[PDB]
Design a protein around this ligand. Structure first.
Ligand SMILES: Cc1cc2nc3c(=O)[nH]c(=O)nc-3n(C[C@@H](O)C(O)[C@@H](O)COP(=O)(O)OP(=O)(O)OC[C@H]3O[C@@H](n4cnc5c(N)ncnc54)[C@H](O)[C@@H]3O)c2cc1C
Ligand SMILES: Cc1cc2nc3c(=O)[nH]c(=O)nc-3n(C[C@@H](O)C(O)[C@@H](O)COP(=O)(O)OP(=O)(O)OC[C@H]3O[C@@H](n4cnc5c(N)ncnc54)[C@H](O)[C@@H]3O)c2cc1C
Ligand SMILES: Nc1c(S(=O)(=O)O)cc(Nc2ccc(Nc3nc(Cl)nc(Nc4ccccc4S(=O)(=O)O)n3)c(S(=O)(=O)O)c2)c2c1C(=O)c1ccccc1C2=O
Ligand SMILES: Nc1c(S(=O)(=O)O)cc(Nc2ccc(Nc3nc(Cl)nc(Nc4ccccc4S(=O)(=O)O)n3)c(S(=O)(=O)O)c2)c2c1C(=O)c1ccccc1C2=O
Ligand SMILES: CC1=C(C)C(=O)C(C)=C(C)C1=O
Ligand SMILES: CC1=C(C)C(=O)C(C)=C(C)C1=O
Lengths: 273, 273
C-alpha cells in the first residue's frame, strides 16, 4: 500500500546537514499519516564486518567456509545473529526505504557498505535465478539522498570529476535494482559547505515538498531481464532478436548497457525510459 | 472569498532571479485554483513621475496646485489618467497582492516608489480620518518578496549595515499598513549572487511550497489605532491609560513605537505578539 517508511542514516555528528535532512523527512511523512522507522547506524553501534560469527550453531562446512552458502542456510534455519534479524524485520515491513549519506570517495560510507553486505542475505534479498526485476523486493520503492563537498559543474560531462550518472550506477543497479526494488530519482545536494545559511533552510523545505508525493513518482529506467537469455549455454547475453532491433538505435539502453553507443542522458538521475 | 491575486514586478531583465521568483508564484497559485493578474512595470513602460498631468480637465486651482487635493477630486469625478485607472482596477479586484523587487539603496526601486506615489490616491487608498486599521484595504493581504546582494549576517543586530527590521518598517507600516492591509511575513532571499546554481533551484521550490497555504497565515503586529487620541487637541498621541500600563513593560510595542525601550524582536520579519 503506501504506508510504512524505513530511513537509514550514515553520519556520526548530530550537528550535520545529513542529520538535518533525516529530521525533515520524518516530519513530512508523519504529516501525511505514514508510519516511520529509523536505522541510525552510528547511534546503533552497528557492526559493519561480515564473518563466520554472523551464524549461530553449526556451519555446514568449517573447512571451506563460504559466506553465500552458509548464510542462506542459517537464514532458512533461523541461525542468524540478532542484530541482522532486527534489521531484516524492519526492511520486510517497509513500503519505502530512504538512504541518507554524504558522498565519501565516490561511493557510500563504510558503515552503509557493511549493512548491505550483512543484511541482504542470499535467499532473503536475492536468488541467482530471480535477479533484477524478478527479485523479492518488487513491491517496494527506494531512493538515495546524497550531499557532496564538490560542485554540480565538477560532476557534469565536461567537469574534472566526470559524469555523476556513472558514479551512481554500481549502487542503483548492482545493489538496489538487483534485489527487485523500484528505484526513484536521487536527491543530490551539491556544494553544501559553500551554500549560505538561509539558502540551506530552503534546501530542506524543497526536500519536504518532494516527499508529499513520492509514492506516485515514476521510477528510473533499467533494461528488463526478459531481454536476456538466462542460462550458461547462452552466457546470460541479450537475445539475438533484441540485438537485431537495437542495431537501428543511436543510444545504448542505459549506463552499464551502453552497447558501445551513446549513453542516454541522465539515465541514473531522471525518470522515464 | 479568497480567490484573486495580483503580482507587481520591478526588474527590467527577464534573465533575473527576480523574474524567476515571479514566474514560480504565478505557477504555484494557478495550480491551487487562483486567478492571477500581473503588473510587470518595466514591460508596461510605466511612468513613475507624479505631476499635474495625471488629472484631466479642470484643476480646481492651477495657481496653487496641491497634489493630494486635486487628485482626490479628480478620482471622485472620474478625471484621472488611464494608466492610473487601469492599475486601480486590478488592485480593487485582488485579495492578495505580492510585490517582487531587488533591494536598491535600502529601499524599493524608483519605478515601484513611483507606482505607490501615483496609484495610491487620497480618497481611494486612504483618508486622514481612516488611517491604518480603519483603512479601505482592511480585507486584503500583502507581502514583500526581496533579493539582496549582501549576506544575512551583515543585516543582523550586530552586522555592519545594522538591523533589517529597521529597513522594512517605513514600507510595511508607512505605506501598506497605513492603507489598511493585513501585512504577511516578507520573503527574504539573501546573498543571491553568491549562492550555488543547484541551491538556487531549491530557493524557488521553498517559495512555491509557502504559497500553497498563504491565505491561512497570521499577519505581522502593528499597534492598533484605538490606543491613540486621534485629533489635533490631543496631538495624535497614545492614550494616558495606555501610557500608564506600558510603564511596566520591558519592550516597545514595535519598531516605530519602541518608546525609548527595547524593540520587541523580529517585529517586522515574524508574525504574532
Ligand atoms: C572520507 C571523506 C571522503 C570524501 N570524499 C568526497 C568525494 O568523493 N566527493 C565530494 O564531493 N566530497 C567528498 N567528501 C566531502 C563531502 O562529502 C562532505 O564533507 C559533505 O557531504 C558534508 O556534509 P555533512 O553532512 O557532513 O555536513 P557538515 O560538514 O555538517 O556541514 C553542512 C553545513 O550545514 C549546516 N547545518 C547543519 N544543520 C543545519 C540545519 N538544520 N539547517 C541549516 N544549516 C545546517 C552545518 O552548520 C554546516 O555549516 C569527503 C569527505 C570525507 C570525510
Ligand atoms: C542601484 C543599486 C543599488 C543596490 N543597492 C543594494 C542595497 O542597498 N543592498 C544590497 O544588499 N544590495 C544592493 N544592490 C544589489 C542587489 O540588490 C542585487 O544585485 C540583487 O538583488 C540581484 O538580484 P537580480 O534579480 O537582479 O539578480 P541577477 O543579477 O539576475 O542574478 C541572479 C542569479 O540568478 C540566476 N538565475 C536566474 N533565473 C534563474 C532560475 N530560473 N533558476 C536558477 N538561477 C537563475 C542568474 O543566472 C543569476 O546568476 C544594489 C544594486 C543596484 C543596481
Ligand atoms: N584560482 C583557484 C581556485 S579559486 O577558488 O580561486 O577559484 C580554486 C582552485 N581549487 C579548489 C577547488 C575546490 C576547493 N574547495 C572544495 N572542493 C571540494 Cl571537491 N570540496 C570542498 N568541501 C568544503 C568546502 C568548504 C568547507 C568544508 C568543505 S569539506 O571538505 O569538509 O566538505 N571544498 C578549493 S578551496 O580553496 O575551497 O579549498 C580549491 C584552484 C585555483 C587555481 O587557480 C589553480 C591553478 C592551477 C592548479 C590548480 C588550481 C586550483 O586548484
Ligand atoms: N578579506 C576581505 C574580504 S573576503 O571576501 O576575502 O573575506 C571581503 C571584504 N569585503 C567585501 C564585502 C562584500 C563583497 N561582495 C558583495 N557585497 C555586497 Cl553588499 N553585495 C554583493 N553582490 C554581488 C555578488 C556577486 C555577484 C554580483 C553581485 S551584485 O553587485 O550584482 O549584487 N557582493 C566583497 S566581493 O569581493 O565579493 O566584492 C568584498 C573585505 C576584506 C578585507 O580583508 C578588508 C580589510 C580592510 C577593510 C575592508 C575589507 C573588506 O571589505
Ligand atoms: C577525498 C575527495 C575526493 C575523491 C573528491 O573527489 C572530492 C570531490 C572531495 C571533496 C574529496 O574530499
Ligand atoms: C549600494 C549598496 C548599498 C547601500 C548596500 O548596503 C549593499 C548591501 C549593496 C550591495 C549596495 O550595492
Amino acid at each position: 500500500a503506501v504506508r510504512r517508511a524505513l530511513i537509514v542514516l550514515a553520519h556520526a555528528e548530530r550537528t550535520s546537514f545529513n542529520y538535518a535532512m533525516k529530521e525533515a523527512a520524518v516530519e513530512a511523512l508523519k504529516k501525511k499519516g505514514w508510519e516511520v522507522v529509523e536505522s541510525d547506524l552510528y547511534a546503533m553501534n552497528f557492526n559493519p564486518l561480515i564473518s563466520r560469527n554472523d551464524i549461530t550453531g553449526e556451519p555446514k562446512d568449517s573447512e571451506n567456509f563460504q559466506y553465500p552458502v552458509e548464510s542462506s542456510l542459517a537464514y532458512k534455519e533461523g541461525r542468524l545473529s540478532p542484530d541482522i534479524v532486527a534489521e531484516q524485520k524492519k526492511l520486510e515491513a517497509a513500503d519505502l526505504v530512504i538512504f541518507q549519506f554524504p558522498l565519501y570517495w565516490f561511493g557510500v560510507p563504510a558503515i552503509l557498505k557493511g549493512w548491505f553486505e550483512r543484511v541482504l542475505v542470499a535467499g532473503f534479498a536475492y536468488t541467482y535465478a530471480t535477479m533484477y526485476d524478478k527479485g523479492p523486493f518488487q513491491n517496494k520503492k527506494t531512493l538515495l539522498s546524497i550531499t557532496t563537498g564538490g560542485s554540480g559543474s565538477m560532476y557534469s560531462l565536461q567537469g574534472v570529476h566526470g559524469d555523476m550518472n556513472v558514479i551512481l550506477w554500481p549502487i542503483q543497479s548492482g545493489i538496489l535494482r538487483f534485489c527487485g526494488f523500484q528505484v526513484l530519482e536521487p536527491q543530490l545536494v551539491y556544494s553544501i559547505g559553500h551554500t549560505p545559511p538561509d539558502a540551506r533552510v530552503q534546501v530542506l523545505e524543497g526536500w519536504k515538498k518532494r516527499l508529499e508525493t513520492v509514492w506516485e513518482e515514476s521510477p528510473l529506467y533499467f533494461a528488463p531481464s526478459s531481454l536476456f537469455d538466462l542460462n550458461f549455454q547462452a552466457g546470460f547475453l541479450l537475445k539475438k532478436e533484441v540485438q537485431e532491433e537495437q542495431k537501428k538505435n543511436k543510444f545504448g539502453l542505459s549506463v552499464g548497457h551502453h552497447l558501445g553507443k551513446s549513453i542516454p542522458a541522465d539515465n541514473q538521475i531522471k525518470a522515464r525510459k
